[PDB]
């Protein structure tokens, strides 16, 4: 599943970010955010 | 207790194919300056 | 059953040297009696 | 007939009689119904007193119809003593190969005669592949011969044994890589003079150890060590300090960069 | 006790190649110094 963790970091992490430039809904900005911010962890025991 | 009955090997088969993937990706120049024939141990 | 089979296998084994043994005392005797002529 | 059983069976009276009413060389020279002659049926029997007798009486070193010579047979059997005097007559002798491309050294490894194995390597037996693409090494390998091999790695000519093998061969590869296939045990031992203490003491502050790698080398060795589930070769110290040297060579940088790009990632988004 | 039992059983399945390592060459010394007549 190394692969698909590694997808899901990438497209997921610019959204909980793209605030710097398009604006978007908080409830998104943070949804994406803690997708992101579980699989970061996840993917780092395969590390 | 099955990854235990094998634990030993499976610790060092990782290692090995860790530095083995490495060193066919590394550049043969690069193993030629920064390998080493022998060492030596002060215990 | 291997707890008991390589016993077994301990007395097989034995009595098959003392066999052997009992076999190397009667080549030896043959040597003692043999007439030798010729082959001195 | 009569010479060759004569010859066979060690009965050196009766070859005294049969060479000296007969002083024709074609008698002792004769062909057999095996190709062979009373040279090889003495030398194959192990008889030490009739193989000298007979070449002291003008034999020749003629070849069997499998194409083996009387040094072949001594070596298939292992008798030392009928090969010492084989080897005082006539050196030259010594390089022969057979219809299949054997040579002694090759028969007496395959068969598992040390003595005799330390006997034609020490007397300058040239090592050689027979046609099947195998040294005698390779040959002592494949047939699990402890002794054999264990004398080999003991001998003055060891690194011109482990030279000589066919690159071109799934079969025969590296001895090293065959001794892990096969004889761990001979690998251990070789691996021992990898590892040479200098001070006899570990408590002193100038006390050191020296690890040599030039077997592990063209990382081969270790993969079939784990490929062979060699757990004992695999922790003996100089694996251990090998794979440590490797590691503090580039292992630990390559993983360190590697793991580093994602921890850019990792902690900003914490 | 098998992982000694064995180990016993290798012992003296040498000392009985051995002895009968030691038997072969009596047997070929009998046929060395027999008189042999009337088979030749």
């Known amino acids: 599943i190394s692969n698909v963790l590694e997808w899901i970091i990438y497209t997921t992490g610019i959204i909980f970010v793209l605030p710097l430039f398009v604006e978007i809904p908080a409830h998104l900005q943070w949804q994406c955010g803690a997708i992101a911010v579980y699989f970061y962890w996840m993917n780092f025991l395969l590390y | 207790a099955d990854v235990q009955k094998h634990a030993s090997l499976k610790r060092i088969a990782m290692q090995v194919e860790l530095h083995t993937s490495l060193e066919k990706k590394l550049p043969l120049w690069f193993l030629r300056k920064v390998d080493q024939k022998s060492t030596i141990v002060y215990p | 059953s291997l707890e008991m089979e390589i016993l077994k296998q301990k007395y097989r084994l034995k009595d098959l040297t003392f066999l052997l043994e009992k076999q190397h005392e009667l080549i030896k005797l043959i040597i003692q009696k043999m007439e030798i002529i010729s082959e001195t | 007939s009569p010479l060759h059983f004569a010859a066979s069976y060690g009965r050196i009276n009766t070859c005294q009689r049969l060479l000296q009413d007969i002083s024709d060389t074609r008698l002792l020279n004769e062909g057999d119904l095996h190709g062979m002659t009373p040279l090889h049926l003495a030398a194959k029997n192990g008889h030490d007193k ?148 200098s001070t006899e003491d570990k408590s002193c502050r100038d006390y050191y150890i020296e690890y040599n790698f030039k077997y592990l080398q063209c990382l081969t060795a270790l993969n079939a060590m784990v490929q062979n589930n060699r757990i004992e070769l695999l922790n003996h110290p100089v694996c251990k300090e090998y794979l440590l040297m490797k590691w503090l060579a580039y292992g630990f940088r390559a993983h360190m960069m590697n793991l580093g790009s994602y921890c850019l990632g990792l902690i900003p988004m914490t």
Request: with cysteine; net charge positive.
């Open chain 4, 50 to 197: 009739v193989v000298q007798l007979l070449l002291k009486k003008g034999a020749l070193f003629l070849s069997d119809h499998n194409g083996w010579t009387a040094l072949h047979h001594a070596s298939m059997g292992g008798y030392t003593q009928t090969m010492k005097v084989i080897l005082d007559t006539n050196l030259k002798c010594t390089d022969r190969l057979d219809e299949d491309g054997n040579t002694a050294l090759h028969f007496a490894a395959r068969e598992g005669h040390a003595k005799a194995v330390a006997l034609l390597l020490s007397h300058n037996a040239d090592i050689v592949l027979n046609k099947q693409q195998a040294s005698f090494l390779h040959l002592a390998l494949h047939n699990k011969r402890k002794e054999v091999v264990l004398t080999i790695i003991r001998s003055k000519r060891w690194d011109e044994c482990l030279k000589i093998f066919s690159h071109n061969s799934p079969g025969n590869k590296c001895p090293i890589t065959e001794m892990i296939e096969y004889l761990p045990e001979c690998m251990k031992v070789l691996l021992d003079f990898c590892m040479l203490h």
